[PDB]
């Protein structure tokens, strides 16, 4: 389709940075959005064939280049906090026909590094009472304490994602919300039939992948650099 | 910290021509330098950003290029409005650091000057001033005599219609000691040294 | 849309203080970086600091060390910019500009205030092919002066020219043209206007 | 910014949606509708060259240029379908150059029939270590609204939906934990509540 990356980033302001999206649907017509909040999705550029650009409705701060048909990379120049949203790329046969978008590149500008902090997952074990009453078990797995929100969950029972019964909260809380720059908490849910838990034999993995810092940053600061990671917690079936 | 010296100081260029500045560097700075434009006593405005990128709303005619340490601008196909003081900034490292501009006038052919002498005011002599008028020149030297060369006191300051400048130069107990104060001024429209008295 | 406005226009002799305020419009202010410059008459600009209005995070050039003051009013959106214990030199239009799309870039300018380091009346002196006269003199503080011909009824052939400033440190300017012929001066700041033959 | 279409609403699960825009000020000719799911991009739903009908499964969209409007209707809409939704419409070489325009988006929840509420609050303890406690509130109807922490010290998460769709099960859930003693498995939750079992 129309691949893109990365999904996720933090860089700090001044840097400069592109954004890779390629297309192998040969399509002729590519260009860039930025998506926010009360603004719907703004045109940044677009190119309607090789070696052709030109200006969207949000251009400045923004550059691009289509060197080949199959490819339409967008620069930053210099990141500004106003520059944190979330960047789609878009493919199309022609300026009329439809956009098919990429997955989307989260994007975070920020003053400083030292407020990139990982996060911390936990997994709560489901309550006796609640298998005793509905036959199903609830597993809730906490991940707190992480900034920015570039972070995606998954639930592994012996070594394989799982979907069916699986909540995850669309949005994070603010764990001091008081905060600009406020570290979050994530929760998710797994719910399964009550024999499911009561088998031993069962291995519950709450994985959190999370996108902090590169190392091709710089980390100061004393404790350890808040590179991108895999957090996971562990819970084991258990008959009572 | 970043010196940005900025070349052709000031130059002169008719209207529609592919006339272009430079701003040299001390430093590297990359590509982190914006041209700005501001109009004769006015708020400058941003221009080019990232040393090559015009902000939206910008005519085609404005375009930067170089890196490093050797930066242009090109307004290729001047036009009346884009005729101001232009200059370059850096923001490589703080503290950010300008070019001190470049002004672009209007090209003519040489303007002959008008010289004026200008008697001083009894209403002022009751509290006198010799006034020198080099009414609508171009291009852009005056010696005042009271036959005496008094240096030391005198001072002097495009128009809107035909690109020529206007100049005046004033003078400033002795008044009244002499008789003859002609004027005198110097420039190549005026090949040669064209030069009243008391009642 | 966007814009920015700096402030009256100060006037202090050497030795104060002074605050300019540059209100910020257009976009979210917390996402935007208040940069002043100031530029003095016949010299090169220069910039003298920044805040950071979203986080209150502020650099000052160094050779204003102590001297100057930025803060960033979250609430009423406007950044201020306090000059201490006043050099003399310290006559320039002081600008406040805006770096919104990227870090440092100064987006967008203010028209700029007017800051030089008392005030007094004028007078004006008549000054008897072309026969060209001109209203001139005298003395004046602070600035700024107008000039009209015959209450403006002619554009083409006045030639009214930029005030300098004389030894006494008080501006006089020359305002000539090139039939009734009167001019009309005008100074703001003292109540004075001649309408003189 | 030609695009009109407005924000938030809410269906119960079952009914059929209609989500419509209006594009008055300009001479549109081709038609889209996009479904955005949070964390991903907008997918391509519908897209139409006409005034007409068109129908693909559960969707149907629809287009009058005579009344410049343009509808999209979901029927036998599922929980699965709460995402939010964007018009977009080309063509009129008059508007943004011909190029698509977006409506800013509305916003769909299809809310879960949950038959045989079991609405209830449980308290869950950590596999390992950390001394923490979350409380479970689920198997609450979807009329049911879980309110905001009003207290600094502790947290609630908004009511999520579930689905074991292997016995075809829904439930909403929210979890609600903090570090403060003062805080147990019954008084999270203080908030828009009916009688339950604890």
């Known amino acids: 389709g129309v691949t893109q990356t990365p999904k996720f980033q933090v860089l700090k302001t001044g840097q400069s940075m592109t954004l890779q999206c390629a297309q192998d649907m040969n399509h002729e017509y590519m260009s860039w959005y930025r998506q926010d909040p009360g603004m719907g999705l703004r045109l940044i550029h677009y190119s309607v064939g090789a070696g052709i650009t030109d200006q969207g409705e949000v251009p400045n701060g923004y550059a691009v280049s289509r060197s080949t048909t199959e490819d339409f990379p967008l620069r930053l120049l210099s990141a500004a906090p106003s520059q944190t949203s979330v960047y789609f790329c878009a493919s199309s046969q022609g300026p009329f026909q439809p956009q098919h978008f990429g997955d989307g590149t989260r994007l975070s500008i920020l003053e400083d590094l030292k407020n990139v902090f990982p996060p911390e997952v936990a997994v709560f074990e489901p309550s006796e009472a609640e298998i005793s009453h509905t036959q199903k078990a609830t597993l809730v797995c906490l991940a707190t304490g992480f900034y920015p929100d570039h972070v995606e969950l998954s639930w592994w029972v012996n070594g394989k994602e799982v979907h069916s019964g699986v909540s995850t909260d669309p949005q994070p809380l603010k764990e001091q919300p008081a905060l600009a720059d406020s570290r979050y908490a994530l929760s998710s849910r797994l719910r399964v039939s009550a024999t499911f838990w009561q088998n031993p034999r069962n291995h519950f993995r709450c994985q959190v992948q999370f996108y902090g810092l590169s190392e091709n940053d710089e980390w100061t600061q004393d404790r350890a650099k808040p590179v991108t990671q895999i957090v996971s917690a562990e819970a084991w079936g258990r008959a009572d | 910290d970043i010196q940005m010296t900025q070349s052709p100081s000031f130059l002169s260029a008719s209207v529609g021509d592919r006339v272009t500045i430079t701003c040299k560097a001390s430093?590297?700075?990359?590509?982190?330098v914006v041209w700005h434009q501001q109009k004769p006593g006015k708020a400058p405005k941003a221009l080019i950003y990232?040393?090559?990128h015009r902000y939206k709303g910008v005519p085609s005619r404005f375009s930067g290029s170089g890196s490093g340490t050797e930066f242009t601008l090109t307004i290729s196909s001047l036009q009346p409005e884009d005729f101001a003081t232009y200059f370059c900034?850096?923001?490589?490292?703080?503290?950010?650091?300008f070019g001190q501009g470049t002004k672009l006038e209007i090209k003519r052919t040489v303007a002959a000057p008008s010289v004026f002498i200008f008697p001083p005011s009894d209403e002022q002599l009751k509290s006198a001033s010799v006034v020198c008028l080099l009414n609508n020149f171009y291009p852009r030297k005056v010696q005042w005599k009271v036959n005496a060369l008094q240096s030391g006191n005198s001072q002097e300051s495009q128009d809107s219609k035909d690109s020529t400048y206007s100049l005046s130069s004033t003078l400033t107990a002795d008044y009244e000691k002499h008789k003859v104060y002609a004027c005198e001024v110097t420039h190549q429209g005026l090949s040669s040294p064209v030069t009243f008295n008391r009642g | 849309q966007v814009q920015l406005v700096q402030s009256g226009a100060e006037v202090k002799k050497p030795g104060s203080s002074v605050k300019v305020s540059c209100k910020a419009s257009?976009?979210?202010?917390?996402?935007?970086?208040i940069h002043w410059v100031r530029q003095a008459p016949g010299q090169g600009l220069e910039w003298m600091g920044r805040?950071?209005?979203?986080?209150?995070?502020?650099k000052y050039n160094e050779k204003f060390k102590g001297r100057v003051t930025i803060t960033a009013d979250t609430s009423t959106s406007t950044a201020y910019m306090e000059l201490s214990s006043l050099r003399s030199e310290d006559t320039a239009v002081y600008y406040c500009?805006?770096?919104?799309?990227?870090?440092?870039?100064?987006?967008?300018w203010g028209q700029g205030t007017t800051v030089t380091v008392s005030t007094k009346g004028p007078s004006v002196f008549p000054l008897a092919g072309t026969a060209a006269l001109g209203c001139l003199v005298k003395d004046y503080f602070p600035e700024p002066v107008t000039v009209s011909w015959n209450s403006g009824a002619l554009t083409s052939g006045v030639h009214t020219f930029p005030a300098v400033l004389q030894s006494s440190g008080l501006y006089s300017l020359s305002s000539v043209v090139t039939q009734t012929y009167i001019c009309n001066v005008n100074h703001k700041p003292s109540n004075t206007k001649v309408d003189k033959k | 910014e030609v695009e009109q279409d407005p924000g938030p609403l809410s269906v119960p699960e079952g009914a059929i949606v209609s989500l419509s825009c209006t594009y008055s000020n300009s001479a549109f000719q081709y038609f889209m509708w996009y479904r955005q799911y949070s964390r991903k991009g907008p997918e391509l739903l519908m897209y139409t060259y006409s005034s007409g009908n068109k129908e693909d499964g559960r969707f149907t969209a629809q287009v009058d240029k005579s009344s410049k409007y343009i509808s999209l209707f979901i029927r036998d809409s599922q929980p699965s379908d709460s995402a939010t939704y964007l018009c977009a419409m080309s063509g009129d070489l008059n508007t943004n150059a011909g190029k698509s325009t977006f409506g800013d988006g509305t916003t769909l929840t299809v809310k879960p029939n949950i038959q045989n509420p079991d609405p209830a609050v449980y308290q869950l303890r950590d596999s390992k270590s950390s001394d923490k406690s979350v409380c479970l509130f689920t198997d609450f109807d979807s009329q049911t609204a879980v309110s905001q922490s009003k207290d600094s010290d502790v947290y609630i998460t908004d009511k999520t939906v579930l689905d074991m769709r292997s016995m075809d099960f829904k439930s909403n859930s929210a979890v609600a934990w903090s570090a403060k003693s003062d805080f147990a498995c019954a008084n999270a939750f203080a908030n828009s509540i009916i009688p339950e079992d604890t």
């Open positions: 500009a805006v770096s919104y799309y990227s870090y440092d870039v100064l987006d967008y």
């Open positions: 257009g976009h979210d202010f917390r996402l935007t970086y």
């Open positions: 805040v950071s209005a979203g986080s209150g995070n502020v």
């Open positions: 430093q590297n700075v990359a590509d982190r």
């Open positions: 990232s040393s090559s």
């Open positions: 900034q850096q923001f490589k490292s703080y503290p950010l650091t």
